[PDB]
Amino acid sequence: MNSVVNNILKAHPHQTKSFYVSSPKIVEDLIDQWTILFPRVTPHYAVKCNNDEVLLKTMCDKNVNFDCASSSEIKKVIQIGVSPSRIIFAHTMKTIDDLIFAKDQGVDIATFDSSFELDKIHTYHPNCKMILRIRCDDPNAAVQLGNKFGANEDEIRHLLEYAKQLDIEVIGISFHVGSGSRNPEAYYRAIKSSKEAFNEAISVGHKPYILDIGGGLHADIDEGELSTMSDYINDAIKDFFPEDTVTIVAEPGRFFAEHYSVLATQVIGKRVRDGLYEYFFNESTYGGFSNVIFEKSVPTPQLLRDVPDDEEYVPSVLYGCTCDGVDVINHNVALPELHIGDWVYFPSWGAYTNVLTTSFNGFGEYDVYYI
Amino acid sequence: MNSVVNNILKAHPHQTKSFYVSSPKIVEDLIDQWTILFPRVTPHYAVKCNNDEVLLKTMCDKNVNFDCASSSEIKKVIQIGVSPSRIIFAHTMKTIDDLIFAKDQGVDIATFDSSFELDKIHTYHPNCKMILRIRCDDPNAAVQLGNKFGANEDEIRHLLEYAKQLDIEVIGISFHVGSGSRNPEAYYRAIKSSKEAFNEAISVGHKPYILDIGGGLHADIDEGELSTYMSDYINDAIKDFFPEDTVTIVAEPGRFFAEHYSVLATQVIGKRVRDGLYEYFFNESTYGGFSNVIFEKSVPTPQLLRDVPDDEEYVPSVLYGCTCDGVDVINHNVALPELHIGDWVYFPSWGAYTNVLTTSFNGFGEYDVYYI
Numbered sequence: 001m002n003s004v005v006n007n008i009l010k011a012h013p014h015q016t017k018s019f020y021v022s023s024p025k026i027v028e029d030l031i032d033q034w035t036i037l038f039p040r041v042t043p044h045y046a047v048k049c050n051n052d053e054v055l056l057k058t059m060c061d062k063n064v065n066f067d068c069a070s071s072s073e074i075k076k077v078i079q080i081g082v083s084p085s086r087i088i089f090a091h092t093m094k095t096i097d098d099l100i101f102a103k104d105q106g107v108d109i110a111t112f113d114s115s116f117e118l119d120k121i122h123t124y125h126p127n128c129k130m131i132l133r134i135r136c137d138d139p140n141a142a143v144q145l146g147n148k149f150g151a152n153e154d155e156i157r158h159l160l161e162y163a164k165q166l167d168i169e170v171i172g173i174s175f176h177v178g179s180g181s182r183n184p185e186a187y188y189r190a191i192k193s194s195k196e197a198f199n200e201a202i203s204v205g206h207k208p209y210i211l212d213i214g215g216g217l218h219a220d221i222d223e224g225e226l227s228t229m230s231d232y233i234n235d236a237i238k239d240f241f242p243e244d245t246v247t248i249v250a251e252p253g254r255f256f257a258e259h260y261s262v263l264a265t266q267v268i269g270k271r272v273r274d275g276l277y278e279y280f281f282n283e284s285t286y287g288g289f290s291n292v293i294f295e296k297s298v299p300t301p302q303l304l305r306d307v308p309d310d311e312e313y314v315p316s317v318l319y320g321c322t323c324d325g326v327d328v329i330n331h332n333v334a335l336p337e338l339h340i341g342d343w344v345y346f347p348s349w350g351a352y353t354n355v356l357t358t359s360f361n362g363f364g365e366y367d368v369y370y371i
Numbered sequence: 372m373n374s375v376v377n378n379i380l381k382a383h384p385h386q387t388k389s390f391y392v393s394s395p396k397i398v399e400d401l402i403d404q405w406t407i408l409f410p411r412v413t414p415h416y417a418v419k420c421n422n423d424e425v426l427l428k429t430m431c432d433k434n435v436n437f438d439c440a441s442s443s444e445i446k447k448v449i450q451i452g453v454s455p456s457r458i459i460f461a462h463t464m465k466t467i468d469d470l471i472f473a474k475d476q477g478v479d480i481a482t483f484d485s486s487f488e489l490d491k492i493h494t495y496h497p498n499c500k501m502i503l504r505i506r507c508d509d510p511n512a513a514v515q516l517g518n519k520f521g522a523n524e525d526e527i528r529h530l531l532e533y534a535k536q537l538d539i540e541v542i543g544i545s546f547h548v549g550s551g552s553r554n555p556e557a558y559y560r561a562i563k564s565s566k567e568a569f570n571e572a573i574s575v576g577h578k579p580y581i582l583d584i585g586g587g588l589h590a591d592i593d594e595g596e597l598s599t600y601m602s603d604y605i606n607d608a609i610k611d612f613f614p615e616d617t618v619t620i621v622a623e624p625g626r627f628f629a630e631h632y633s634v635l636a637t638q639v640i641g642k643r644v645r646d647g648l649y650e651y652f653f654n655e656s657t658y659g660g661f662s663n664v665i666f667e668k669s670v671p672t673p674q675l676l677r678d679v680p681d682d683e684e685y686v687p688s689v690l691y692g693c694t695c696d697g698v699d700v701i702n703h704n705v706a707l708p709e710l711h712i713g714d715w716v717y718f719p720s721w722g723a724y725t726n727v728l729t730t731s732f733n734g735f736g737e738y739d740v741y742y743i
């Protein structure tokens with residue numbers, strides 16, 4: 001990667017903007033690994049994590065399906081040539097006009113957690129196949145979601161009866177434990193709860209066939225080897241949904257998107273005060289680094305410039321380029337001394353990075369280089 | 372405003388996106404008031420706060436100047452036809468390529484707070500007139516700035532000497548106490564420290580003539596009149612420390628002018644009621660026009676467009692943004708009349724750090740704009 005990025009800069013000596021270096025081959029390899037790790041689980045990629053056109057085309061060609069959250073994301077995936085039949089509108093709150101658009105296009109599987117949402121479906125998308133989303137938190141996930149979405153245990157039967165009353169087909173149950181989860185017990189308990197909800201749906205008169213395990217998993221790699229979350233999920237699947245008549249799906253975002261890209265950024269400013277080395281980059285928490293704010297990320301850059309093995313590290317502060325004092329990429333990191341014009345890159349910067357860009361202060365521009 | 376927004380909706384029956392309703396006349400009136408409040412102080416509008424083109428043109432035509440933070444902001448202002456002499460590049464950290472752009476465009480005044488910044492000026496824009504930015508904090512400001520910008524007291528003399536050594540003209544001193552400030556004492560202290568810095572610059576051999584009091588002020592209105600709690604004491608500090616007619620005083624206000632420029636209308640698209648708690652999902656979000664909820668701890672109350680009886684029951688409500696993120700909550704708890712899917716509401720005074728911070732996260736973030 002160091003050589004690749006150095007070669008890009010040598011080939012484009014005029015490069016000014018920060019830039020993503022993205023590798024479709026990494027994602028293809030991870031898809032092949034998903035298949036080995038989760039042989040029963042069909043991934044519906046969470047488009048919202050990273051909507052890069054090349055990435056979406058990459059998945060499409062590898063028979064990965066899609067999780068879309070809005071009409072705009074539906075449009076993106078259709079434009080790539082994917083069948084609307086491969087999309088789940090896995091957002092429990094959908095506008096009337098997005099629902100009409102979904103129906104027209106052929107996006108006819110969606111999630112819900114409210115009776116008012118069922119009223120909307122009845123009126124505007126009556127044959128949409130519905131997945132009931134239930135609340136099942138991992139208290140240790142980086143990003144929490146349980147208050148805002150998913151049905152409470154006490155309302156599962158009421159929602160299912162209400163759907164039956166409106167002649168709405170409920171074909172499954174989903175959950176999301178939280179984004180950025182490394183708690184395998186959270187998935188186990190969620191799948192157990194899902195089986196209970198599944199049984200309540202049968203009790204009510206539905207004929208459900210989909211377990212949807214949501215997202216939240218990392219593709220954690222130690223020593224070039226993907227760790228096997230998957231083992232415990234597959235065990236819960238076997239314990240609670242052993243029947244081959246059940247279709248299992250997931251909504252992974254970060255699993256595939258995280259390692260897709262690195263982000264290269266330049267030191268554009270410098271200030272040294274009483275032993276502390278402060279640097280300003282042509283990036284910010286309002287650009288590709290919103291994860292610093294929302295996921296408490298503390299990223300360490302890789303220097304493109306070679307330094308000897310015994311280079312002195314100095315205490316460094318990495319600031320974003322905006323006016324704002326909250327916009328700090330890393331408050332304290334030991335690094336070799338950097339200089340205005342030095343390029344660095346942050347590994348594994350493909351998840352919830354480029355999708356969260358703003359043009360605040362007139363910044364936020366970046367280029368993208370493929371392979 | 373309630374009637375204005377209803378008339379917009381009646382005239383545009385197909386309206387689906389959230390929309391800002393923006394009024395140049397409100398800003399024109401506030402410019403006139405600024406003249407009264409601050410008769411010695413030339414405002415350089417902080418374009419980062421709201422870069423709406425109509426807004427920028429309204430300010431251009433009212434002889435208000437500009438504070439640009441980047442090459443893109445410089446571009447926006449020049450394309451409006453504003454003379455380069457009216458722009459201060461008031462960002463102490465500027466890319467070499469942005470400095471080269473500023474030089475091409477005629478943007479020949481900027482701020483700094485580091486010796487390496489002077490190295491860049493010397494090499495790339497040696498004719499640029501420099502304003503030394505000093506750290507002077509309002510600890511009660513909504514958005515803190517001092518950590519990241521402004522020279523410390525013990526480095527003021529060395530930075531000035533360094534500029535002198537490089538043959539760089541230092542023509543004044545600036546500070547920003549922090550954004551969203553209601554502390555008049557912070558300004559008085561900052562202006563005092565600025566005079567001390569100003570005198571150090573004269574001691575070194577510079578000929579400064581500019582005080583730049585930065586930004587931070589709200590246009591706080593009660594009963595149709597702007598409060599002078601901040602202006603009065605800022606003027607008292609100016610009289611104490613910079614009474615000389617030979618000193619030009621400027622400010623970098625953003626929110627003062629932008630805050631009341633717009634309202635943001637948004638629709639109820641989803642509803643859930645559980646155990647007497649009324650939850651609503653809107654076609655807006657904290658990743659859209661509502662970043663202030665996160666970064667400024669805003670707790671915004673919407674105005675209903677639908678008329679309700681004077682004794683109509685309020686219910687406890689939760690106002691959710693349209694994204695899949697749990698952090699995306701507009702208001703955690705607010706008492707309101709029951710709402711229904713299709714109801715429009717609007718948020719008053721929603722022009723400062725609102726539309727400029729929009730993202731397309733989840734495929735949302737789109738909005739329309741109506742003027743007057």
Ligand SMILES: *C(=O)c1c(COP(=O)(O)O)cnc(C)c1O
Nearest residue numbers: 323417550551586587623625626
């Ligand atoms: C913003 O932090 C900022 C402004 C404008 O602040 P207000 O909108 O008036 O609160 C002006 N100048 C600088 C250097 C800023 O960073």
Ligand SMILES: Cc1ncc(COP(=O)(O)O)c(C=O)c1O
Nearest residue numbers: 046179180215216251253254695
């Ligand atoms: C409904 C839903 N599915 C999937 C995801 C993807 O999450 P992750 O990128 O952690 O796998 C999210 C994100 O919060 C989500 O809300």
